[PDB]
Amino acid sequence: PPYPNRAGWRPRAPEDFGDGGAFPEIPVAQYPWGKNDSSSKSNALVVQVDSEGKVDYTAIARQGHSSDRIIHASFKDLIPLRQRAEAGQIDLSR
């Protein structure tokens, strides 16, 4: 149901949301993806996300360390610095 006629019609599934995002003009408990009701203090590490929007398994490598510590934990750290796709101009100066 496009704009501006969704009155009376309530979404029942996340497919009823279109691609998602709760409809603010219908007063009802809307959840665009699902329910996280109560997790009984599950002691797992919280699954964080890296810069490009993917799962990060360096959170196991960095565990028990300070944030300012240099830790090589990926294959990118094995590549020579010129051949990395991040940059090409590096100031090698004291």
Partner 1 sequence: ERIRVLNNRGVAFITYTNEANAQFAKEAMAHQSLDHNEILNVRWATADPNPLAQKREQRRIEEQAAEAIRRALPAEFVAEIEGKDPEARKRRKLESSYGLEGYEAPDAVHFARGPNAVNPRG
Partner 2 sequence: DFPSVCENCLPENPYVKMLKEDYGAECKLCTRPFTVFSWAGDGRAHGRKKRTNICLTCARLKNACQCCIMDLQFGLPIVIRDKALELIAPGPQSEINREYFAQNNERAIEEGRAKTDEKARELLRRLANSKP
Partner 3 sequence: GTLDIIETEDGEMIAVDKDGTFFSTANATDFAQHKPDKAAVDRLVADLRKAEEASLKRRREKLAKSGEEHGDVTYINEKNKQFNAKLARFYNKYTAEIRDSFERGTMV
Q: Which residues bind partner 2 (CB under 8 A)?
A: 41, 64-68
Taking CB under 8 A as the criterion, which residues in 52-81 touch partner 3? Answer: 53-55
Helix (H, G, I), strand (E, B) or coil at 76: helix
The single residue among 20, 31, 61, 77 that binds partner 3, judged by CB under 8 A, is 20
CA pair distance 65, 71, nearest whole angstrom: 9
CA pair distance 45, 20, nearest whole angstrom: 27
CA pair distance 38, 40, nearest whole angstrom: 6
Whether a cis peptide bond, with omega within 30° of 0, leads into 4 is yes
Q: Does 47 bind partner 3 (CB under 8 A)?
A: yes
Q: Which stretch binds partner 3 (CB under 8 A): 2-10, 13-21, 60-68, 70-78?
A: 13-21
Question: Choosing among partner 2, partner 1, partner 3, none, which partner's interface includes residue 29 (Cβ < 5 to 8 Å by kind)?
Answer: partner 1
Tokens read off for 74: 């990926």
Q: Which stretch binds partner 3 (CB under 8 A): 7-15, 23-31, 65-73, 79-87?
A: 7-15
